Amino acid sequence: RGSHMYLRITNIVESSFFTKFIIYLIVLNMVTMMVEKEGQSQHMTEVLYWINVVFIILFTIEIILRIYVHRISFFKDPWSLFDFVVVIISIVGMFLADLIETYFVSPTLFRVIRLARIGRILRLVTAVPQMRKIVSALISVIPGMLSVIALMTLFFYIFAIMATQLFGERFPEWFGTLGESFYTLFQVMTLESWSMGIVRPLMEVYPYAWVFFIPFIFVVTFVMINLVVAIIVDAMAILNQKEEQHIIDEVQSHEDNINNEIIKLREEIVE
């Protein structure tokens, strides 16, 4: 009762059972989103409607429970914040999308309201602790890349300006505008058909075109290599920092073990 019911309900919501229970509900809902098919029985559609209604109310009480326990902190964990947004979107996608599309009719919404499906797939990241771990690890790498990504973007902009001015007059489908050139240089960076598809046709007209694209490949490959090396040595720095301190801690343990006796070894002379 009261705060004792809160103490009871917390020991449920934070339980390993409740964590696992919600994971299986997501998997079952994800499976039901695979069995749907435009070519299906009307009664199958009705049954799938009731089943999907059961899921949306069942995840709704989950959100309410999690809000009731975590309260002010719920709307600050990005994972809980994402799950809340997905529940809201999935309510709209089943009880107001008709009321939307019947007035703001647009052939985009038949494609945009898919987002209510995609969001419920992504809950399979948010609920699984091992998946939150890997995703937060991946996200934490991004800040260290920003300076080399900014450098690569500036090099791309410089080369896109030059490639538009050099080749865009006669190969506009590849370089005729800055946006054409950005796309074609990205293809070349991926090495996709870079010679047979782009540069050999260019050298029919621009014999020294190899002097542009081969140095370009070296630059972007070298920056990509150092981008990957940076991620390696950053992760290794996080490791080595621990190995280092653990050795120091044991050196300072040995400092304690010995010097606290070198203290005694002089008062032991007072006798």
């Epitope: 007059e169 006669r170 190969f171 506009p172 489908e173 007209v205």
Partner: antibody, heavy 122, light 109 residues
Framework: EVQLVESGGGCVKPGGSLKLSCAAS????????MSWVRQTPEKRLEWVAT????????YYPDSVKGRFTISRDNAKNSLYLQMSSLRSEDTAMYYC???????????????WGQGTCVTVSS | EIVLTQSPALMAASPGEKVTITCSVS???????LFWYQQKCETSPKPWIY???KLASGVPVRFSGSGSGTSYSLTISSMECEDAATYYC?????????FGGGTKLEIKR
């Protein structure tokens, strides 16, 4: 063989409108830019339109800007010239021509069709 | 945008004469960008020289082309009756093709 055959043409009234068609064979039509070239009765050659190999870029002289529109269908392997507000100036043989180099929207015209006549006359 | 002028407008060359026709350009252009066509009577033009000097496939090696900048020429080392035709120079720049007026070779049979 690489072959081009133009079609349409014939008589029109001044101010009239006409669509020329060119059928391509013996080469990958979608790899090449294509041009239309006039030959006027005094045998002066005059280029009138160019289209890129994907059709996304088109080029014209100011003699025909807004009056003409070059277009292509890379599946039909066909090239078109819509003409409008036709004038006695536009009385010419019109040749469909392939560019010498792939994707190049410039350079030279390595194969020319047989042509179709246009006679803008009252 | 760039005008090409050809001289002479008509030429009357003996069989076996060396023939030279000139194309003059109102601005300096790359020799890679000047081309020649041969048009026979009431047929479409055919490419004849690619750039200033590379003969097109099947052009008799008695033909040659030479020039740079604002002045270009096509030469026949020894004219034959099959050479009697109108020859057009052409350039490309900006996004326009322009053609010369043509030179009609009469062969004085």
């Amino acid at each position: 063989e690489v072959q081009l055959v133009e079609s349409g043409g014939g008589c029109v009234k001044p101010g009239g409108s006409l669509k020329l068609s060119c059928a391509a064979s013996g080469f990958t039509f979608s790899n090449y830019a294509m041009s239309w070239v006039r030959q006027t009765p005094e045998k002066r050659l005059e280029w009138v339109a160019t289209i890129s190999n994907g059709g996304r870029y088109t080029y014209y002289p100011d003699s025909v800007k807004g009056r003409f529109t070059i277009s292509r269908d890379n599946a039909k392997n066909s090239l078109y010239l819509q003409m409008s507000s036709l004038r006695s100036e536009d009385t010419a043989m019109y040749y469909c021509a392939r560019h010498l180099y792939r994707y190049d929207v410039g350079g030279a015209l390595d194969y020319w069709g047989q042509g179709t006549c246009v006679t803008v006359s009252s | 945008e760039i005008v090409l002028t050809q001289s002479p407008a008509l030429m009357a060359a003996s069989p076996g004469e060396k023939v030279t026709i000139t194309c003059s350009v109102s601005l300096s252009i790359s020799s890679s960008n000047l081309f020649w066509y041969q048009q026979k009577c009431e047929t479409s033009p055919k490419p004849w020289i690619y750039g200033t000097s590379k003969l097109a496939s099947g052009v008799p090696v008695r033909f040659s082309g030479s020039g740079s900048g604002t002045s270009y020429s096509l030469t026949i080392s020894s004219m034959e009756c099959e050479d009697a035709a109108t020859y057009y120079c052409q350039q490309w720049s900006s996004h326009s093709f322009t053609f010369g007026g043509g030179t009609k070779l009469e062969i004085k049979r």
